[PDB]
Structure 1
Amino acid sequence: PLSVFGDRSTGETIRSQNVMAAASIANIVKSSLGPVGLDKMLVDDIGDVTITNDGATILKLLEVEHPAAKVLCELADLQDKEVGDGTTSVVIIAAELLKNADELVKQKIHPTSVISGYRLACKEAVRYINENLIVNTDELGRDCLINAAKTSMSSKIIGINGDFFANMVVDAVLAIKYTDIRGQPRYPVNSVNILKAHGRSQMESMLISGYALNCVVGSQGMPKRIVNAKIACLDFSLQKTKMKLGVQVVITDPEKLDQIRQRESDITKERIQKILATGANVILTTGGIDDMCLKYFVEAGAMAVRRVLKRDLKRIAKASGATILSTLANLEGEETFEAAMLGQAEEVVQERICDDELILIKNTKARTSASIILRGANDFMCDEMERSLHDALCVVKRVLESKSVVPGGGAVEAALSIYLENYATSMGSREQLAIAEFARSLLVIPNTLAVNAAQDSTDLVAKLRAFHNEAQVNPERKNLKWIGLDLSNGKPRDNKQAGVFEPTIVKVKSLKFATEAAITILRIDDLIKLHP
């Protein structure tokens, strides 16, 4: 009757398929949650091997066919983009919410009522988190940042070495700190150039008090160490001059060909002479440099680096005070290069790192910059350290920007579950079931942590819920709001005292994104799949 060239699913079938797909995506990454979680290996069809614990990377690398699974994968990607941490918790929470909402729907509860209940529960959870479970970081000091970094690097390849990696992360983030208009301290992460090089152990990873380039000097005749570096940043190639498309050379008097050919290279020669005449020592360009210009730099005893990355060049110019010049043209139609466009550094060296060389611009002036050189056993290990390091940097940035943190280890989830199951009795008649299911779904995080720890999940979560219920009922027991999970010993523990923190924005964004994804999937009750 429809005569539609495709398959159709309607009613319970499509809802069950969507929930099964979401649950499968959840179960894919449920084994990499919490410090007792374990990494996974992803192998391509060409033999490429990837070892990672990050949920977003795992979901990006996998091939996904079902649209709901695609929704969850893009939810994880969005959570990574907007926050940088919690990319697994958001997926798990969204899948659990979808499962509980589908169970409610199978109980003949209309999906609109469930959606309204989920919206109310999300709003009240955000409000309760912002009003009760936040901890101000002003009175905690640098220990708060250290603990946040250590918590973020748990369940990662650099977990046990956290005592050192957290110091590195905090130092780098504080080094790249700057202030903008209206006095907001902004921390531009991704300005920390993360360099990888296998070899010696992790503890030999170096935090550079400057910048690091993954490139070497163009010529072997140039010195590989300059003390008082006058860095000149350029955005144009230094090679033989060639006329543009609209300019053509036509010779009628043969005596002028030699002069033409000489001028052709003398133009670049005089440009290099103008650049060197101001005392420049290090010359970095995004374009290439041919042989004669390299020799010109060699004879002057000055560095010259070609094919420098644009972002690296911009960072070097910003840190050292230099300005990038795409051309040597002033405001009076001449070629010139003043000393004002020269950045300065305390030292520029080409260091050797495991049979390979890289350039270290050390201790730039007028601005502090940082870079990290990661040393690992092999390439996969270095990649995983880089991913974990980026996650830690993002967490520290979130903590420094917004000065509120919340206890970790499922304490927030248990407190929210207790508060929501108490609050659901206050409003509505059919939405109360939805809010109760939201509270129950919020408990998937501590349960997953306990399961990963191979502990008694039921008893441990029951004890956590009892502690939080006592905290919420007794007004003189507010100190129990911080009772999290001690995964090493499998017992409840005051996580705020133990130093297990995480940014409030992580939880807020995870809750909002998971609620929106569950709502989006829940509206679907009919599928049409046209044949290709």
Structure 2
Amino acid sequence: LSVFGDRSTGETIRSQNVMAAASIANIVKSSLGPVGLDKMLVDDIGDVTITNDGATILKLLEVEHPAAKVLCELADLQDKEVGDGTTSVVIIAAELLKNADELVKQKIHPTSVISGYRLACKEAVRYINENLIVNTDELGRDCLINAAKTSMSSKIIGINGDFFANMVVDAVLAIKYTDIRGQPRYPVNSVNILKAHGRSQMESMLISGYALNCVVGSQGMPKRIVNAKIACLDFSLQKTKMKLGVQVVITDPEKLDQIRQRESDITKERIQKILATGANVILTTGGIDDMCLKYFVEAGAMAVRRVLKRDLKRIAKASGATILSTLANLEGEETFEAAMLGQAEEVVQERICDDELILIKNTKARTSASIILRGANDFMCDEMERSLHDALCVVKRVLESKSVVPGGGAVEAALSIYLENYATSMGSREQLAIAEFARSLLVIPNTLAVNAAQDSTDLVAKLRAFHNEAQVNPERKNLKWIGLDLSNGKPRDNKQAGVFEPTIVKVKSLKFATEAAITILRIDDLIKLHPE
């Protein structure tokens, strides 16, 4: 008996939640797999956004029903953890929820289903770790290209997949980083991505260094420096304030002029101290005043203003320069040291699409990687940068975990039958949940085929037949195989075909899907409240 809203219980709300989950599934059901077809959103005012990556779609799609919000947040988390599988994980969650409900829709007690699901997830991850493929023996760049171009289909760039994979692997190997003293961690998002409409991705270029989306401050100031004198400076450049409250009171007028004089001479001497070091390149997130600009021109150095903090931090990491929030010393006097300087072979501002952007090539301290995109419109460019970010994510996963999974749905292809066999072991009722888990998880090949528009039942049956054969005659070195394809509409060996996915993708995907199913299935009543 609650004001400002009714309540729904039992079958009604269960069916409602399944209905919402199926809706969300069908929202993205058409954007997965090497024949996935991307989505696009007329926002409300024309600023459209083409994208096939599911998490982006979910974030940009307003949602009101609770369970759908749950799925959206799950997709966002998955993106924060893998990069793709938002192609997949939402579908997995929805399908598992659907079949679990179908069991419950009869009578079956939910907690039994939950326990069965938990067992299913644990069994599945164990079987995957018995199904793993190790890349260490395999050629590094080879499998990296494979995983990349595997992710590259279902995207705008899958056609140029070969070139794009080459570029991506080069960048990621160039962004090596020594971690906690025992880990070669590779930072995603460390590589810099800039979009620039114009030429095709054919002409999109990899930068053996770092690239700036900034401009030269003073037109008279030069354009290219073949020398590596690069200094960073957080400390802004203005004729300084008194900066807290310091009122200036005059009882002897004879000194106002000299006061004003040093009001700029302070910045003048700071600049001269900087330049006497011989630094020819300066960057600054803070403001840059014309006073400094003209001094720099007379010195002929390089100056950039209003640069984003992350970019300059990356600059310090690459060139080996030191981020400097100010000028100071262990002693009070403000000095500057050449040791603070970073180096790079040549720094150029260049005109791409009549917009001058600043390039930094071959920092000697630490190799950096940046990528420039070229395309027709801003829509294609930013959707492809989303794609590339996913690419770098998956390659990072591959390097971090020397372990790979055969792509194209071999995962659930094996999993369905293996869990089917394992189900009879339990003997309880929960093997019914196990079997439904398997059958639902069989959705990925179904969606693959339908988006590829051929007889899906026959492909799925052939897949299951091959895997079941792989579960007969345990001499499976010549009887264990793995694979599935779409372009020819018939099975293959993805291991030979190079269709690979990182293990963590499927692992974390199944785990999060199981958690989502547990959360939503335990629902049996919503109670609404009209707002204040």
Indicate how the Cα distance of structure 1 residues 428 and 488 shifts in structure 2: closer, same or farther if over 3 A, else same: same
Indicate how the Cα distance of structure 1 residues 312 and 481 shifts in structure 2: closer, same or farther if over 3 A, else same: farther
Contact 1:133/1:481, CA 8 A, preserved across alignment: no
Contact 1:137/1:144, CA 8 A, preserved across alignment: no
CA distance in 2: counterparts of 1:423 and 1:313, whole angstroms: 55
- How big is the alpha-carbon RMSD for the aligned residues of Structure 1 and Structure 2? 1.1
The superposition leaves residues 29-74 of structure 1 with CA deviations (integer Å, 9 ceiling, x where unpaired) of 0000101111111111111111011000011111111101001111
The superposition leaves residues 431-453 of structure 1 with CA deviations (integer Å, 9 ceiling, x where unpaired) of 01000000111100011000100
How far the C-alpha of 1:479 sits from its partner, in A, is 5.2
SS at match of 2:145: helix
CA distance in 2: counterparts of 1:246 and 1:67, whole angstroms: 52
CA distance in 2: counterparts of 1:262 and 1:3, whole angstroms: 73
The superposition leaves residues 240-291 of structure 1 with CA deviations (integer Å, 9 ceiling, x where unpaired) of 1111233110000010100101010000000000000011000001111111
Contact 1:133/1:412, CA 8 A, preserved across alignment: no
Contact 1:470/1:477, CA 8 A, preserved across alignment: no
Indicate how the Cα distance of structure 1 residues 208 and 479 shifts in structure 2: closer, same or farther if over 3 A, else same: farther
TM-score normalised by structure 1 residue count: 0.98
Indicate how the Cα distance of structure 1 residues 17 and 410 shifts in structure 2: closer, same or farther if over 3 A, else same: same
Contact 1:157/1:385, CA 8 A, preserved across alignment: yes
The superposition leaves residues 370-401 of structure 1 with CA deviations (integer Å, 9 ceiling, x where unpaired) of 00000001100101110111111111100011
Contact 2:135/2:143, CA 8 A, preserved across alignment: no
CA distance in 2: counterparts of 1:225 and 1:3, whole angstroms: 72
CA distance in 2: counterparts of 1:265 and 1:194, whole angstroms: 38
How far the C-alpha of 1:476 sits from its partner, in A, is 1.9
SS at match of 1:195: strand
CA distance in 2: counterparts of 1:472 and 1:187, whole angstroms: 38
Contact 2:470/2:481, CA 8 A, preserved across alignment: no
CA distance in 1: counterparts of 2:116 and 2:216, whole angstroms: 63
Indicate how the Cα distance of structure 1 residues 295 and 3 shifts in structure 2: closer, same or farther if over 3 A, else same: closer
| 400-409 or 474-483: bigger deviation | 474-483
CA distance in 2: counterparts of 1:223 and 1:182, whole angstroms: 42
CA distance in 1: counterparts of 2:243 and 2:431, whole angstroms: 74
Q: Which runs of 5+ in 2 are unaligned?
A: none
Identical pairs, percent: 100
How far the C-alpha of 1:483 sits from its partner, in A, is 2.8
Indicate how the Cα distance of structure 1 residues 12 and 481 shifts in structure 2: closer, same or farther if over 3 A, else same: farther
SS at match of 1:448: helix
Indicate how the Cα distance of structure 1 residues 179 and 230 shifts in structure 2: closer, same or farther if over 3 A, else same: same
SS at match of 2:283: strand
How far the C-alpha of 1:337 sits from its partner, in A, is 0.5
Contact 1:233/1:284, CA 8 A, preserved across alignment: yes
- Hey, what does 1:140 align to over in structure 2? 139
Whether 1:438 and 2:437 are equivalent positions in the alignment is yes
CA distance in 1: counterparts of 2:356 and 2:193, whole angstroms: 15
Indicate how the Cα distance of structure 1 residues 236 and 33 shifts in structure 2: closer, same or farther if over 3 A, else same: same
CA distance in 1: counterparts of 2:437 and 2:398, whole angstroms: 27
CA distance in 1: counterparts of 2:60 and 2:478, whole angstroms: 43
How far the C-alpha of 1:108 sits from its partner, in A, is 1.0
Contact 1:223/1:302, CA 8 A, preserved across alignment: yes
Contact 1:173/1:396, CA 8 A, preserved across alignment: yes
Contact 1:138/1:403, CA 8 A, preserved across alignment: no
- Hey, what does 2:498 align to over in structure 1? 499
Contact 2:13/2:526, CA 8 A, preserved across alignment: yes
How far the C-alpha of 1:25 sits from its partner, in A, is 0.2
Contact 1:374/1:386, CA 8 A, preserved across alignment: yes
Within a 5 Å distance, the mapping from 1:121-132 to structure 2 comes to 121-132=120-131
TM-score normalised by structure 2 residue count: 0.98
SS at match of 2:322: coil
CA distance in 2: counterparts of 1:133 and 1:427, whole angstroms: 25
Contact 1:467/1:480, CA 8 A, preserved across alignment: no
- Hey, what does 1:474 align to over in structure 2? 473
Contact 2:132/2:403, CA 8 A, preserved across alignment: no
- Hey, what does 1:393 align to over in structure 2? 392
CA distance in 1: counterparts of 2:305 and 2:118, whole angstroms: 55
How far the C-alpha of 1:178 sits from its partner, in A, is 1.2
How far the C-alpha of 1:3 sits from its partner, in A, is 4.7
Contact 2:473/2:479, CA 8 A, preserved across alignment: no
CA distance in 1: counterparts of 2:86 and 2:510, whole angstroms: 12
CA distance in 1: counterparts of 2:56 and 2:481, whole angstroms: 31
| 125-134 or 302-311: bigger deviation | 125-134
Aligned length: 531
How far the C-alpha of 1:480 sits from its partner, in A, is 5.4
| 244-253 or 114-123: bigger deviation | 244-253
How far the C-alpha of 1:482 sits from its partner, in A, is 4.2
| 41-50 or 460-469: bigger deviation | 41-50
How far the C-alpha of 1:136 sits from its partner, in A, is 3.6
Indicate how the Cα distance of structure 1 residues 374 and 479 shifts in structure 2: closer, same or farther if over 3 A, else same: farther
CA distance in 1: counterparts of 2:497 and 2:4, whole angstroms: 61
The superposition leaves residues 326-381 of structure 1 with CA deviations (integer Å, 9 ceiling, x where unpaired) of 11111110010011001111000111101111110111111000000000011001
Contact 1:483/1:492, CA 8 A, preserved across alignment: no
SS at match of 1:400: helix
How far the C-alpha of 1:199 sits from its partner, in A, is 0.6
CA distance in 1: counterparts of 2:245 and 2:37, whole angstroms: 62
CA distance in 1: counterparts of 2:228 and 2:140, whole angstroms: 37
